[PDB]
Design a protein around this ligand. Structure first.
Ligand SMILES: CCCCCCCCCCCCC/C=C/[C@H](O)[C@H](N)CO
Ligand SMILES: CCCCCCCCCCCCC/C=C/[C@H](O)[C@H](N)CO
Ligand SMILES: CCCCCCCCCCCCC/C=C/[C@H](O)[C@H](N)CO
Lengths: 246, 270, 240, 44, 270, 44, 270, 44, 48
């Protein structure tokens, strides 16, 4: 009554037979914007069916000597589905998300993963250069990876000068290959403004760093994938105009 | 929500000899901190704790003055300083402990001389908001300050001190901004505008010596900022790597400093 | 004019002073607040979260295998696995956690600690450990019979893959300065050791090498007194 | 101890106002949905 | 007459499909501003506005100090200044935004030296009303100030500051006067008295160094005026042309500066 | 917030007195004699 | 427990002629002070005493300022002083009259020059708690005092004065400690750590001249401490031997000074 | 005589508080167990 | 600003003066007291 679960959101469902919990980020639920905190005058739109559903990304192979991956959360979904059309035609965007990262393995594989959300996960440019105009900066396909993700170069500092050891102050879970196979986080809309564009600003970002690397014996399955499914809970848009890709 | 001072006291406990009640076996795979306390593991006594925790709020932790910037005036005639408190690594790390912060401020101006003294001259401090014209000379018309707030103080006076409100267009100051300020084709080589929040640009701080001819002194005014009425949101880990730039969280690829000093073996506590 | 004398303390600028100041902007109202999730009110909310310790901070550990305690199968009984000091204001494993970076801003601490060990290994690998805390006195114990004389816990790798050893507040003085070394060995807290209680037993066709992830946090009665500045930040020239 | 007294119409130029001891550690330490007891196994 | 703070909030609105109710078609030929609001044109939501408009009154807009005149003292021994605030174009334009103004004043006196310093000398500021004899020397009998208000202040003191009431014989100060002060045959060539209101001549402001011999310093005292308890009437457009004279609204026939900068075409917003 | 306090008999030496939010925009925006509605044609 | 001012008055008494009632024969072998009073020995009169004893409490006896330490600054650039009040034999003997003391403090800083004057320079006093890094230069980063309490005062100002609370980890300050701070093999020859209470080490007091270049002056700052809110326990005899060391009660084996001056004979009062 | 007035929240920065005339000389002068009278022989 | 003249005794440091002082540590509470036997309250207890 605690390990089996089903998460029906829209016309999509997620079944699992061994999980641990569902961490609720900062103990709060994704809500609609109240009339007190709102500042825009135009009426917002609410599809409520076509955008609040589980979108599944491509799978990431988990090699033995892997470093990690990271995705921006309002940016992985801009070309896929009706959510990308809504977040390309409109100008303002407010929604929470509902994470789920699956990584199944047999009872003879060992390893663990740390999955977490990092609000305002700013990517740092690597290189010793204390000169404003000569310093290195990350490219556009590194700050905003897209739907194909991006790998870490130094997962020990989260590619931002911040220790991974104390990265447990974030809403997170573990995927221990002996206990569970799925980590899920229900994150609300965290921002300093009530509404914000979904093309220039990426609210937060998932990180999956493989601590205690994958180990197995000969004869077992080598290809161990990693699949993540997102659900934009309580999406609402505003400021309809011409569609802009990026 | 509980509101109390001191510290949670302990209660008397005895030994437990039964099955099914296991307070020690936790499960960290759920992303929750363990809730096992003193009384359930070991036999304990009763104590009444009086160790006040008033000094651990985020309003007593930040309400302490601290150097934010230094302004060298040669006497070009004047000197400017773009207001950004992320220039000295002492008050930058405490503010970067958090993601969003909403607070009032209180700046203190301490001006000295080259060798260190206080000659009875006069100084004008002028705050230039975003959009107001910066002064182009020591006897320009911008110094008429018909609307800009200015302070006229001497070197032989106590250090000047003003109070500054929350002057941001957003609802809070964010130090980390995961995005670009504008639309368009962003480059792959030199993203010189990534992680630049426009809600934190507060203007320019100018200073001149009120005179007609040129005074032959090289001054140096230090700005000491203190935070008050501070609210904080979304805590985040404290930085361990040395700072390189001022507006960017750049670190060094090689020679990454470990977050714990080395010892001989893993089976030797000392 | 009302008579009024001036006292010592006139014209001084105390840094940690609570006083008013002249406002620059008259008749100003800031931007209205909104509801941002995750508001902090004290620094005792950040100390009660588990955070991986760097117990493997020895040399020859490369970049990320410094958070892992290697476990394998032995040949002699009563073996030892790892050992580390308890002092959070000390150089070592507690330097990499979150309570040992907040108790470094303050020059005093009090209350109980908490260390949580999570076992990352195969599902078929059983075993038992004896993690034992020892109050001050002699050096680190050499035998397991000496280590079991303190306040130990017997944790066995089962379906629940995490145990928590609470470190009780056993001190003479009410508080302890978070600066040990020299004449400040009067404020030491003791040694936490982890022993190979029975063995690490593994079936065939399964790796015989696993890892334990140690985490650490504060307790309900944790408190801190007298703020200071940390020793980490070093700056030669201004960040231009 | 008169300290709260202000001398202007602007309220942001006063001292450190009332010290409220608000503390909600249940949102950083136990954010899971299903409330877990502390005297039972987490995963039944 | 309505009295309220914040800003008028909006109300929810739906679409209208009917004839005879047209809120968009106005008629500017009636000299009335259009009254169409947000709700009637587009479908809108409900918001509660809290954006305070306290900072937009004519009493917070004028209650800001500002340079009105400068007085150069060579030490003739003394120096005079006919009180007229229309000499610097920063505070002149805000006051010429209106036609009639009734207010109190608060002058601040900031005196410096040639190179800029404050030597411990003594200064006498004396106000000479219309009709009182102006001083003819540095040691004359007019400085005995048996009835004129005077201020004795040093250079090493804080800047002096006095409060001045509404001292006009009319009911308000008018900046624009469409007439002549006297009767008679007015000329066609040089009307040197047109637009000269006699209700604004307030007197002369004199300053000397209190001594017996001559002090070898060249001072410079700046008069900073602040308005308060201000009432305004009959608003009028703000001037766009550069100022030429002090008491006259003269502009330049040739090279008239347009009130909007040029662009390429009329079909290109940028 | 004691600020209105004066220290002389002359009332013109005090601070900025009570802030009244008086506002009559109907004399600059709609000065016509015949009151026009906003949901009808101005000139019938 | 009796609480009263003035002094216990006497009562009238007459002669006693009886057996068995002997108030004069005491017995000092019981370790108790004799309780015989005036009235019982001699015939006395009645008096009402009004000689107030308010000036004999341990709170009026210690609430008097007194030199605790002197700090010579040459301008190394800076100067430090480990806080320990047992360096001058005037305030050391009154505090060593008692064993345990719990009190607040109030330090006063009096800084002079070599020949004795007060040049208008600036000084920074910084308190370094145990564990905080001591400054290594006159322009180091420790002087940024983001958390340490500091005082910025001039030489031409009144002497600085701050209030210090009870900052000990134990419940009271003990001056005499009959033990060692650590475990281990203690030596027989040089016990350089016997009688060293770790609960009295309060930190380091640093002082610098706030400047950039080097100021050519040799200063000397005197620290005047005053006790208040003082509680005392376990009184002990006052020292009669001259002091030799600072942290140790060492005296001289030879030439022991007698606690009473010599006279000719034992049968000659004068 | 207003002297006790403080001007901060910290109570250790005030003046010399209330002067209580507490005095128990019976613990230094007569600490013996058996209470001895002053009009009789100490050792009967 | 309230008018106020300065009197003799300004800027002097009287040794036996009873006055307040600015506290260095804001919001501080010391170590709790315990019961230590033999508390003195006056110097007239040591003279008897
Ligand atoms: C001349 C006297 C008045 C001086 C006014 C200076 C204060 C105006 C700037 C407000 C400072 C707000 C605090 C810092 C704001 C942002 O966080 C910084 N830009 C950080 O980058
Ligand atoms: C020496 C100390 C007292 C100085 C008194 C100077 C103030 C007396 C003049 C009153 C000024 C009223 C404000 C300006 C009046 C008219 O509008 C100007 N003439 C404008 O042309
Ligand atoms: C720079 C301004 C603040 C200066 C702060 C200095 C006071 C901090 C030290 C507290 C002194 C407590 C009284 C003396 C304590 C112990 O008895 C001494 N170590 C005696 O050896």
């Amino acid at each position: 009554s605690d390990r089996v679960a089903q998460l029906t959101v829209g016309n999509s469902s997620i079944t699992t037979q061994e999980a641990a919990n569902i961490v609720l980020a900062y103990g709060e639920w994704p809500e609609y914007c109240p009339d007190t905190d709102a500042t825009a005058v135009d009426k917002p739109t609410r599809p409520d069916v076509s955008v609040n559903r589980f979108y599944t990304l491509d799978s990431k192979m988990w090699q033995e000597n892997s470093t990690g991956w990271y995705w921006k959360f309002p940016d992985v979904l801009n070309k896929t589905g009706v959510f990308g059309q809504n977040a390309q035609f409109h100008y303002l965007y407010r929604s929470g998300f509902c994470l789920h990262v699956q990584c199944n393995a047999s009872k003879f594989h060992q390893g663990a993963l740390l999955v977490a959300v990092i609000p305002e996960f700013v990517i740092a440019g690597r290189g010793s250069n204390t000169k404003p105009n000569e310093a290195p900066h990350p490219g556009f396909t590194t700050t905003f990876p897209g739907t194909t993700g991006a790998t870490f170069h130094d997962p020990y500092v989260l590619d931002s000068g911040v220790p991974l050891s104390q990265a447990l102050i974030y809403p997170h879970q573990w995927i221990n290959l002996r206990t569970n196979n799925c980590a899920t986080v229900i994150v609300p809309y965290i921002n300093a403004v009530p509404f914000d564009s979904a093309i220039n600003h990426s609210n937060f970002g998932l990180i999956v760093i493989p601590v205690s690397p994958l180990k197995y014996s000969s004869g077992a399955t080598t290809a161990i994938p990693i699949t993540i499914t997102i659900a934009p809970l309580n999406s609402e848009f505003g400021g309809l105009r011409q569609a802009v890709s990026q | 929500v509980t509101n109390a001072e001191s510290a949670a006291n302990t209660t008397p406990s005895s030994h437990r000899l039964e099955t099914g009640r296991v307070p020690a076996l936790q499960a960290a795979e759920t992303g929750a901190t363990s809730n096992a306390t003193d009384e359930n593991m070991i036999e304990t006594r009763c104590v009444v704790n009086r160790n006040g925790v008033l000094e651990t709020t985020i309003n007593h932790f930040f309400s302490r003055s601290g150097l934010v910037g230094v302004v060298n005036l040669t006497d070009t005639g004047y000197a400017t300083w773009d207001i950004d408190i992320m220039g000295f690594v002492q008050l930058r790390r405490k503010c970067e402990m958090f993601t969003y912060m909403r607070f009032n401020a209180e700046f203190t101006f301490v001006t000295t001389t080259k060798n260190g003294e206080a000659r009875p001259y006069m100084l004008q401090y002028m705050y230039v908001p975003p959009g107001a014209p910066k002064p182009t000379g020591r006897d320009a018309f911008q110094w008429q300050t018909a609307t800009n707030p200015s302070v006229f103080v001497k070197l032989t006076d106590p250090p000047a001190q003003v109070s500054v409100p929350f002057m941001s267009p957003a609802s809070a100051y964010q130090w980390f901004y995961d995005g670009y300020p504008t639309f368009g084709q962003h480059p792959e080589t030199s993203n010189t505008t990534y992680g630049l929040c426009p809600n934190n640009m507060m203007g320019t701080f100018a200073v001149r010596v009120v005179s007609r001819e040129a005074s032959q002194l090289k001054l140096q005014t230090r700005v000491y900022m203190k935070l008050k009425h501070v609210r904080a949101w979304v805590p985040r880990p404290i930085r361990s790597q040395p700072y390189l730039l001022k507006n960017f969280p750049n670190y060094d690829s090689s020679k990454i400093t470990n977050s714990a000093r080395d010892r001989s073996s893993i089976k030797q506590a000392n | 004019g009302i008579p009024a004398e001036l006292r010592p303390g006139t014209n001084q600028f105390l840094t940690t002073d609570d006083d008013t100041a002249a406002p620059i902007l008259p008749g100003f109202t800031p931007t209205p607040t909104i509801h941002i999730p995750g508001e902090v009110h004290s620094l005792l909310e950040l100390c009660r979260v588990e955070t991986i310790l760097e117990v493997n901070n020895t040399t020859e550990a490369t970049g990320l295998t410094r958070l892992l305690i290697p476990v394998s199968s032995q040949n002699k009984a009563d073996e030892l696995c790892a050992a580390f000091m308890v002092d959070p204001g000390r150089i070592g494993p507690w330097q990499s956690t979150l309570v040992g970076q907040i108790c470094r801003y303050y020059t005093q601490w009090s209350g109980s600690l908490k260390v949580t060990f999570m076992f990352t290994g195969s599902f078929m690998a059983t075993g038992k450990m004896l993690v034992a805390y020892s109050p001050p006195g002699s050096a680190q114990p050499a035998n397991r019979e000496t280590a079991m004389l303190g306040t130990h816990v017997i944790w066995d790798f089962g379906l629940q893959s995490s145990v928590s050893l609470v470190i009780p507040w056993i001190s003479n003085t009410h508080f302890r300065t978070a600066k040990t070394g020299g004449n400040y060995d009067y404020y030491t807290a003791g040694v936490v050791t982890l022993w190979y209680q029975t063995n690490y037993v593994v079936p065939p066709e399964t790796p015989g090498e696993a890892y334990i992830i140690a985490m650490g946090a504060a307790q309900d009665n944790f408190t801190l007194k007298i703020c200071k500045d940390t020793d980490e930040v070093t700056q030669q020239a201004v960040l231009q | 101890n008169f300290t709260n007294i202000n001398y202007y119409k602007d309220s942001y130029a006063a001292s450190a106002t009332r010290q409220d001891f608000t503390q909600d550690p249940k949102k950083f330490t136990q954010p899971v949905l299903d409330s877990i007891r502390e005297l039972s196994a987490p995963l039944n």
